Design a protein around this ligand. Structure first.
Ligand SMILES: CC(=O)N[C@@H]1[C@@H](O)[C@H](O)[C@@H](CO)O[C@H]1O
Lengths: 121, 121
Protein backbone atom coordinates (compact mmCIF):
# COMPACT_ATOMS: atom_id res chain seq x y z
CA UNK A 1 0.00 0.00 0.00
CA UNK A 2 1.83 3.01 -1.36
CA UNK A 3 1.90 5.97 0.92
CA UNK A 4 4.09 8.75 2.40
CA UNK A 5 4.57 10.38 5.78
CA UNK A 6 6.01 13.77 6.80
CA UNK A 7 8.20 14.31 9.92
CA UNK A 8 9.95 17.45 11.22
CA UNK A 9 9.14 21.16 11.30
CA UNK A 10 8.41 23.86 8.79
CA UNK A 11 11.78 25.31 7.95
CA UNK A 12 14.00 24.80 4.89
CA UNK A 13 13.97 24.77 1.12
CA UNK A 14 12.42 21.53 -0.20
CA UNK A 15 14.53 18.86 -1.96
CA UNK A 16 14.03 15.61 -3.82
CA UNK A 17 15.99 12.40 -3.38
CA UNK A 18 15.86 12.24 -7.16
CA UNK A 19 18.56 14.74 -8.29
CA UNK A 20 19.74 13.76 -11.72
CA UNK A 21 19.07 11.66 -14.74
CA UNK A 22 21.17 10.26 -17.56
CA UNK A 23 20.82 7.38 -20.00
CA UNK A 24 22.97 5.24 -22.28
CA UNK A 25 20.99 4.64 -25.48
CA UNK A 26 21.33 3.59 -29.12
CA UNK A 27 18.14 2.27 -30.67
CA UNK A 28 17.21 1.03 -27.20
CA UNK A 29 17.94 2.16 -23.64
CA UNK A 30 21.12 0.36 -22.53
CA UNK A 31 21.12 2.15 -19.17
CA UNK A 32 19.49 4.77 -17.05
CA UNK A 33 21.75 6.69 -14.69
CA UNK A 34 20.04 8.06 -11.50
CA UNK A 35 22.02 10.52 -9.27
CA UNK A 36 25.13 9.15 -11.02
CA UNK A 37 24.41 5.49 -10.28
CA UNK A 38 24.43 3.20 -13.38
CA UNK A 39 21.64 0.71 -14.03
CA UNK A 40 22.06 -1.32 -17.25
CA UNK A 41 24.84 -2.27 -19.66
CA UNK A 42 27.61 -0.53 -21.59
CA UNK A 43 26.12 -0.22 -25.03
CA UNK A 44 24.84 2.93 -26.70
CA UNK A 45 26.05 6.46 -26.07
CA UNK A 46 25.98 8.29 -22.77
CA UNK A 47 23.68 11.29 -22.77
CA UNK A 48 24.51 14.50 -20.95
CA UNK A 49 23.33 14.64 -17.32
CA UNK A 50 20.03 16.38 -16.45
CA UNK A 51 20.15 17.72 -12.89
CA UNK A 52 16.85 19.04 -11.46
CA UNK A 53 16.86 22.50 -9.97
CA UNK A 54 15.32 23.38 -6.62
CA UNK A 55 11.58 22.71 -6.81
CA UNK A 56 11.93 21.17 -10.33
CA UNK A 57 10.45 17.74 -11.09
CA UNK A 58 9.20 15.69 -14.03
CA UNK A 59 5.56 16.72 -14.88
CA UNK A 60 5.36 15.06 -18.27
CA UNK A 61 7.04 11.92 -19.48
CA UNK A 62 6.92 9.96 -22.83
CA UNK A 63 8.28 6.37 -22.71
CA UNK A 64 8.21 4.05 -25.79
CA UNK A 65 8.42 0.44 -24.60
CA UNK A 66 7.87 -3.26 -25.42
CA UNK A 67 9.93 -6.01 -23.77
CA UNK A 68 12.56 -3.27 -23.21
CA UNK A 69 12.61 0.50 -22.86
CA UNK A 70 12.96 1.96 -26.37
CA UNK A 71 12.83 5.64 -25.70
CA UNK A 72 12.41 8.25 -22.89
CA UNK A 73 11.73 11.96 -22.91
CA UNK A 74 10.29 14.14 -20.19
CA UNK A 75 9.43 17.67 -19.41
CA UNK A 76 9.73 19.44 -16.05
CA UNK A 77 7.28 21.86 -14.32
CA UNK A 78 9.84 24.55 -15.15
CA UNK A 79 9.67 23.95 -18.84
CA UNK A 80 13.05 22.20 -19.21
CA UNK A 81 13.27 19.01 -21.29
CA UNK A 82 15.28 15.80 -21.61
CA UNK A 83 15.39 13.51 -24.63
CA UNK A 84 14.02 11.81 -26.56
CA UNK A 85 16.85 9.29 -26.42
CA UNK A 86 16.43 5.78 -27.86
CA UNK A 87 14.84 4.18 -30.93
CA UNK A 88 11.42 4.59 -32.63
CA UNK A 89 10.40 1.07 -31.56
CA UNK A 90 7.85 -0.01 -28.91
CA UNK A 91 4.42 1.43 -27.89
CA UNK A 92 4.25 5.12 -26.70
CA UNK A 93 2.75 5.72 -23.22
CA UNK A 94 2.52 9.20 -21.70
CA UNK A 95 2.37 10.69 -18.20
CA UNK A 96 0.93 14.10 -18.01
CA UNK A 97 0.21 16.51 -15.17
CA UNK A 98 2.29 14.39 -12.83
CA UNK A 99 4.99 14.73 -10.26
CA UNK A 100 7.62 11.95 -10.50
CA UNK A 101 8.73 11.08 -7.01
CA UNK A 102 10.97 8.11 -7.86
CA UNK A 103 12.30 6.00 -10.75
CA UNK A 104 12.92 2.30 -10.02
CA UNK A 105 13.17 -0.39 -12.66
CA UNK A 106 14.84 -3.69 -13.67
CA UNK A 107 18.02 -3.86 -15.81
CA UNK A 108 20.47 -6.43 -17.22
CA UNK A 109 22.64 -5.45 -20.19
CA UNK A 110 19.72 -3.30 -21.33
CA UNK A 111 17.04 -1.29 -19.53
CA UNK A 112 14.20 -3.86 -19.35
CA UNK A 113 11.59 -1.98 -17.28
CA UNK A 114 10.89 1.20 -15.27
CA UNK A 115 8.62 1.50 -12.28
CA UNK A 116 7.74 5.15 -12.05
CA UNK A 117 6.37 6.42 -8.69
CA UNK A 118 4.41 9.59 -9.16
CA UNK A 119 1.62 11.95 -8.13
CA UNK A 120 -1.18 12.31 -10.61
CA UNK A 121 -2.60 15.87 -10.52
CA UNK B 1 -2.73 11.24 -6.08
CA UNK B 2 0.19 8.94 -5.21
CA UNK B 3 0.59 5.95 -7.49
CA UNK B 4 3.01 4.17 -9.88
CA UNK B 5 3.21 2.62 -13.32
CA UNK B 6 5.48 -0.09 -14.89
CA UNK B 7 6.74 0.28 -18.49
CA UNK B 8 8.74 -2.39 -20.45
CA UNK B 9 9.07 -6.19 -19.76
CA UNK B 10 9.72 -8.88 -17.13
CA UNK B 11 13.46 -9.64 -17.12
CA UNK B 12 16.59 -8.13 -15.54
CA UNK B 13 17.47 -7.49 -11.92
CA UNK B 14 15.52 -4.97 -9.84
CA UNK B 15 17.09 -1.58 -8.97
CA UNK B 16 15.97 1.50 -6.87
CA UNK B 17 16.79 5.12 -7.54
CA UNK B 18 17.54 5.27 -3.79
CA UNK B 19 20.97 3.69 -3.44
CA UNK B 20 22.90 5.51 -0.69
CA UNK B 21 22.44 7.37 2.62
CA UNK B 22 24.68 9.34 4.94
CA UNK B 23 23.76 12.07 7.47
CA UNK B 24 25.58 14.97 9.25
CA UNK B 25 24.51 15.09 12.92
CA UNK B 26 25.10 15.91 16.57
CA UNK B 27 22.11 16.39 18.83
CA UNK B 28 19.96 16.92 15.77
CA UNK B 29 20.42 16.35 11.98
CA UNK B 30 22.38 18.99 9.98
CA UNK B 31 22.14 17.22 6.65
CA UNK B 32 21.08 14.07 4.89
CA UNK B 33 23.15 12.90 1.89
CA UNK B 34 21.10 10.91 -0.61
CA UNK B 35 22.97 9.03 -3.31
CA UNK B 36 25.90 11.48 -2.85
CA UNK B 37 23.81 14.72 -2.91
CA UNK B 38 24.13 16.91 0.14
CA UNK B 39 20.92 18.43 1.65
CA UNK B 40 21.36 20.78 4.60
CA UNK B 41 24.23 22.43 6.51
CA UNK B 42 28.02 22.05 7.17
CA UNK B 43 27.42 21.33 10.83
CA UNK B 44 27.69 18.24 12.95
CA UNK B 45 29.57 15.03 12.19
CA UNK B 46 29.49 12.99 8.92
CA UNK B 47 28.26 9.46 9.27
CA UNK B 48 29.62 6.58 7.12
CA UNK B 49 27.65 6.13 3.97
CA UNK B 50 25.15 3.27 3.81
CA UNK B 51 25.00 1.79 0.22
CA UNK B 52 22.16 -0.61 -0.50
CA UNK B 53 23.12 -3.94 -2.05
CA UNK B 54 21.24 -5.58 -4.90
CA UNK B 55 17.71 -6.33 -3.64
CA UNK B 56 18.11 -4.50 -0.33
CA UNK B 57 15.73 -1.71 0.87
CA UNK B 58 14.73 -0.08 4.13
CA UNK B 59 12.19 -2.34 5.96
CA UNK B 60 12.03 -0.48 9.30
CA UNK B 61 12.97 3.12 10.16
CA UNK B 62 12.86 5.11 13.37
CA UNK B 63 12.84 8.86 13.11
CA UNK B 64 13.01 11.24 16.05
CA UNK B 65 11.77 14.76 15.29
CA UNK B 66 10.39 18.07 16.55
CA UNK B 67 11.05 21.28 14.66
CA UNK B 68 14.01 19.43 13.16
CA UNK B 69 14.80 15.83 12.33
CA UNK B 70 16.64 14.82 15.48
CA UNK B 71 17.62 11.23 14.91
CA UNK B 72 17.43 8.60 12.15
CA UNK B 73 18.05 4.95 12.31
CA UNK B 74 16.90 2.24 9.89
CA UNK B 75 17.08 -1.53 9.28
CA UNK B 76 17.08 -3.21 5.80
CA UNK B 77 15.38 -6.41 4.64
CA UNK B 78 18.83 -7.97 4.90
CA UNK B 79 19.44 -7.34 8.58
CA UNK B 80 21.70 -4.29 8.19
CA UNK B 81 21.42 -1.28 10.56
CA UNK B 82 22.13 2.39 9.88
CA UNK B 83 22.39 4.56 13.00
CA UNK B 84 20.81 5.60 15.29
CA UNK B 85 22.50 8.94 14.35
CA UNK B 86 21.53 12.21 16.13
CA UNK B 87 20.07 13.35 19.43
CA UNK B 88 17.73 11.79 21.96
CA UNK B 89 15.09 14.53 22.06
CA UNK B 90 11.90 15.23 20.03
CA UNK B 91 9.30 12.47 19.47
CA UNK B 92 10.02 9.03 18.06
CA UNK B 93 7.99 7.60 15.12
CA UNK B 94 8.57 4.15 13.56
CA UNK B 95 7.81 2.64 10.19
CA UNK B 96 7.73 -1.20 10.29
CA UNK B 97 7.05 -3.76 7.57
CA UNK B 98 7.71 -1.17 4.86
CA UNK B 99 9.73 -0.76 1.74
CA UNK B 100 11.07 2.79 1.45
CA UNK B 101 10.78 4.14 -2.05
CA UNK B 102 11.97 7.72 -1.76
CA UNK B 103 13.22 10.20 0.76
CA UNK B 104 12.41 13.94 0.11
CA UNK B 105 12.58 16.72 2.75
CA UNK B 106 13.40 20.35 3.52
CA UNK B 107 16.77 21.59 4.53
CA UNK B 108 18.59 24.82 5.39
CA UNK B 109 21.46 24.97 7.84
CA UNK B 110 19.81 21.93 9.34
CA UNK B 111 17.48 19.13 8.23
CA UNK B 112 13.99 20.38 8.95
CA UNK B 113 11.68 17.71 7.60
CA UNK B 114 11.55 14.40 5.61
CA UNK B 115 8.68 13.22 3.45
CA UNK B 116 9.14 9.46 3.26
CA UNK B 117 7.51 7.57 0.41
CA UNK B 118 7.05 3.90 1.12
CA UNK B 119 5.08 0.77 0.54
CA UNK B 120 3.27 -0.31 3.75
CA UNK B 121 3.00 -4.14 4.23
C1 LIG C 1 9.43 -5.03 -32.99
C2 LIG C 1 8.68 -3.73 -32.78
O1 LIG C 1 8.01 -3.29 -33.68
N1 LIG C 1 8.77 -3.10 -31.58
C3 LIG C 1 9.60 -3.65 -30.51
C4 LIG C 1 8.83 -4.23 -29.29
O2 LIG C 1 7.88 -5.25 -29.63
C5 LIG C 1 9.94 -4.74 -28.34
O3 LIG C 1 9.55 -5.60 -27.26
C6 LIG C 1 10.58 -3.44 -27.87
C7 LIG C 1 11.38 -3.53 -26.58
O4 LIG C 1 12.49 -4.42 -26.71
O5 LIG C 1 11.36 -2.95 -28.97
C8 LIG C 1 10.54 -2.50 -30.06
O6 LIG C 1 11.34 -2.01 -31.16
Amino acid sequence: SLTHRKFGGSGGSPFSGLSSIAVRSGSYLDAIIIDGVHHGGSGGNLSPTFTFGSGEYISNMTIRSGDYIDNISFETNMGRRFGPYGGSGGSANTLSNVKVIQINGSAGDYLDSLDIYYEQY
